[PDB]
Design a protein around this nucleic acid. Structure first.
Lengths: 71, 115, 86, 62, 105
RNA sequence: CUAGAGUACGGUAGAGGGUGGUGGAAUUUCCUGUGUAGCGGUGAAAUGCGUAGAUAUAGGAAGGAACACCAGUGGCGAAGGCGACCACCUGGACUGAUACUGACACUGAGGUGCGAAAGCGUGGGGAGCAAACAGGAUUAGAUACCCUGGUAGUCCACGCCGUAAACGAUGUCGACUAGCCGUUGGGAUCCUUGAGAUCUUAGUGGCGCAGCUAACGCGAUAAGUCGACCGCCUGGGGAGU
C-alpha cells in the first residue's frame, strides 16, 4: 500500500499547486540515475503526475537537479 | 616512470573489445584488443577473449606501478562484465566500477533494419 | 474580447431590458469580435486552425439577421444602419 | 555507480544495479530505425497483453 | 501581469549584486509595477557546469508589471555577463512572502 | 408557451494553432597531447581505413536536425495531424448556478475551403540517414536480399499539386432498449479516518441478454427498434482504361 499512500502525498494535503522549489519533495520522485519514475510505482493520481513532470523539467533547467551521472 | 591510481577504460562492441589503462590526465599507458590475441572471427566476439586481452593489458601496466584502478565499462556487447573479473586476477585493487554509456535523448536516426 | 468590453456593449444596445438574450444584443457582440480579429490574421497568415473559428461567428451572424427580418422590418433597418452591414 | 569487502559481492551489486536502472535494453533498440507505424504495433500488442493478463489471472484467482 | 522572474548571476559578481537589484527594479517602478517579494537565496553549488563554473548566486523576485517593463528585463538579462541564466514565468495570482529559505536555511 | 437552439456568469483540463527565444545528451568534421599495431565488418569473408601515427583516450572549437525517462485501451483536433522549456498573440470543448431571447432547427445537388508522404518552382541551409549509382560477396545467373561508400531528397521561407489500406473497410442528426468490470474530468450526496461510499452527466476500453445476421460477429460508442435529408450499387474481363 506504499503505492496507495503516495497518491495521498498530494491529494490528502492542500498542496495542489506544487512548485519547483521544494526539492525535499522532488527528490522522493527521482531515481538514483536521474530519470523520472513511473506512475504505477508511486501510484500518484494522473492529474498530479502530469503536474509533477513540469516541476522536474523546470528545476532541471535551473541546475537544481542533474540529468545523468555523466555531468 | 611512476604513476599510481590509474583508470581502466573498457570498450565493448558486438565484434571486438578494447581495453586501455590510463591516468587521471587521460593519457595512454597500455592498450590491448581482442583481435591482437589471435582470434579473428566468430571466436573474436566471445567473452573468453575479453579475458585474454584484459590480463595482457594488465601486464604492461606494471611497468609504471598502478596499484589502484578505476573502471569505466562502456558498450552493449558480451564480455561486458567478464573483463572486470580478469582485472584483479592480475592483482589490482579495484576501487569503484562505473557505467558510461552514450544514450541520445533523441539523437540522429540510426541505420535501417536488416532483412 | 475582454469582460468590460462586453459590458460596454450590453449597456449600449439594450432593449430597455437589462437582458442579454435579444438579437440586438447578440448581433452586436459578434460584430465587435470579428473586427478585432482582422489584425490577428494579417500578422498570422498560416493560422488555419484559428481561421476555422472565425467563420463560425460570421455564419452565426447571418442567421440571426434573417430571424430578425423574418419578424420585423423596423427593428431590422434600425440595426443595420447603426452598425453598417450588408 | 558501484563503490566498494570481497569482490564477488560488488559484482552482483553492479550487474543488478545496471539492470535495475536500465540502459541495456535501450541500447539494443538503437541499431535499427523503426518507422512510427511499427512503434504503434508495440503500443498495440502490449496493451492487449496487459488487459488480457488482468483477466487470465482471475481464472487463477477463482 | 504577475510574473515570477528568477535569474542567477556569476559567482564573481555576487558582491556587486546589491546595486544590481535596485538598478532593475527602479525601472519597473517607472512603469507602474509594484514588487511583492525580493529574495536572495545566496551562493550555492550547481548540479553541472554552466560555462565552466560551479557556484552561483540565486535571485528570486516576483514582479507585477505591464507589458513595457517585461520588455525591459527581457533585454537586460540578454545584455549582461553577470547573469548567466534566467527564467520568466507567469502565474494568474498574487504573491506571499518567505517561501522556503526558512526551510532551506 | 419553453422542453429544441443560442446568449450573458463563475470555474477547470489539454502534444489545438501561429510568431520568436533558450537549453542538455548523443553523432560527425577540425585542432592539440599521450600512445602504437591493426581497426571495421560478416553465415564466414572481401572491398574499405591504417606507422604519411588509425581505433582508443583527454582538451577545445564549429555546425545541423531531433526532443530519452515521464508515456498510459492517456489527451486534444472537423479530418490529415499534433510530444524539450518560457514569453507572445489565438480557436473550441467541458461543469455549476442564474437570468434572458421564444423555434431562431435539421440536412444539403451544384459551389466554396482545409488537403499525410513522395514530387514540382525560386531562394536559403548540408549533422546523420539515404532511392539513383559504384565496388566487394553470394549466386548456373543476381539487375536483388547482406557489406563498404554515396547524390537528389528529408530541414526553412514562399507558391503549387490534390490523390492513399485518406480505415471503425461502418454519411451526418434525433429518440427508446437487461447487466458487470475498467479509465480520463467535473460536480454531487455522504458517517468520516478513509487504500471512502453510492448516484449523475461528457469521453474512451473489455465481456454480455434480448434482438438482428448467409455466417463471422456487433450488442447505450448497434450491424437492435424507428424517423429526416444526401451519396452510391446492378455478372467477370475489357476498364477507372
Amino acid at each position: 500500500f506504499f503505492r496507495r499512500r503516495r497518491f495521498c502525498r498530494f491529494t490528502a494535503e492542500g498542496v495542489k499547486e506544487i512548485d519547483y522549489k521544494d526539492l525535499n519533495t522532488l527528490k522522493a520522485y527521482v531515481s538514483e540515475t536521474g530519470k523520472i519514475v513511473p506512475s504505477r510505482i508511486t501510484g500518484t493520481k494522473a492529474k498530479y503526475q502530469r503536474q509533477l513532470a513540469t516541476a522536474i523539467k523546470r528545476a532541471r533547467y535551473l541546475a537544481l537537479l542533474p540529468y545523468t551521472d555523466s555531468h | 616512470k611512476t604513476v599510481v591510481d590509474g583508470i581502466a577504460h573498457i570498450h565493448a562492441s558486438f565484434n571486438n573489445t578494447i581495453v586501455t589503462i590510463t591516468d587521471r590526465q587521460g593519457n595512454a599507458l597500455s592498450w590491448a584488443t581482442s583481435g591482437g590475441s589471435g582470434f579473428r572471427g566468430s571466436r573474436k566476439s566471445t567473452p573468453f577473449a575479453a579475458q585474454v586481452a584484459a590480463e595482457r593489458a594488465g601486464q604492461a601496466a606494471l611497468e609504471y606501478g598502478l596499484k589502484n584502478l578505476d573502471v569505466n565499462v562502456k558498450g552493449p556487447g558480451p564480455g561486458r562484465e567478464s573483463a572486470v573479473r580478469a582485472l584483479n586476477a592480475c592483482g589490482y585493487k579495484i576501487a569503484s566500477i562505473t557505467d558510461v554509456t552514450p544514450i541520445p535523448h533523441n539523437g540522429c536516426r540510426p541505420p535501417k533494419k536488416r532483412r | 474580447l475582454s469582460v468590460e468590453e462586453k459590458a460596454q456593449i450590453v449597456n449600449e444596445y439594450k432593449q430597455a431590458e437589462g437582458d442579454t438574450g435579444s438579437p440586438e444584443v447578440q448581433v452586436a457582440l459578434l460584430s465587435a469580435n470579428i473586427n478585432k480579429l482582422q489584425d490577428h490574421f494579417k500578422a498570422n497568415g498560416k493560422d488555419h486552425h484559428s481561421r476555422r473559428g472565425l467563420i463560425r461567428m460570421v455564419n452565426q451572424r447571418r442567421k440571426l439577421l434573417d430571424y430578425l427580418k423574418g419578424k420585423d422590418v423596423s427593428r431590422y433597418t434600425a440595426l443595420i444602419g447603426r452598425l453598417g452591414l450588408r | 555507480k558501484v563503490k566498494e569487502e570481497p569482490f564477488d559481492v560488488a559484482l552482483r551489486r553492479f550487474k543488478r544495479s545496471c539492470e535495475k536502472a536500465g540502459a541495456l535494453a535501450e541500447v539494443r533498440s538503437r541499431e535499427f530505425y523503426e518507422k512510427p507505424t511499427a512503434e504503434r504495433k508495440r503500443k498495440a500488442a502490449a496493451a492487449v497483453k496487459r488487459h488480457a493478463k488482468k483477466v487470465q489471472r482471475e481464472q487463477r484467482r477463482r | 501581469r504577475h510574473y515570477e522572474i528568477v535569474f542567477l548571476v556569476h559567482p564573481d559578481q555576487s558582491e556587486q549584486v546589491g546595486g544590481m537589484v535596485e538598478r532593475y527594479t527602479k525601472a519597473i517602478e517607472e512603469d507602474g509595477g509594484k514588487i511583492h517579494r525580493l529574495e536572495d537565496w545566496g551562493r550555492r553549488q550547481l548540479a553541472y557546469a554552466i560555462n565552466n563554473v560551479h557556484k552561483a548566486h540565486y535571485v528570486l523576485m516576483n514582479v507585477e508589471c505591464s507589458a513595457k517593463a517585461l520588455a525591459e528585463l527581457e533585454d537586460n538579462f540578454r545584455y549582461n555577463d553577470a547573469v548567466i541564466r534566467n527564467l520568466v514565468m507567469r502565474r494568474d495570482e498574487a504573491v506571499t512572502e518567505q517561501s522556503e529559505m526558512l526551510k532551506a536555511e
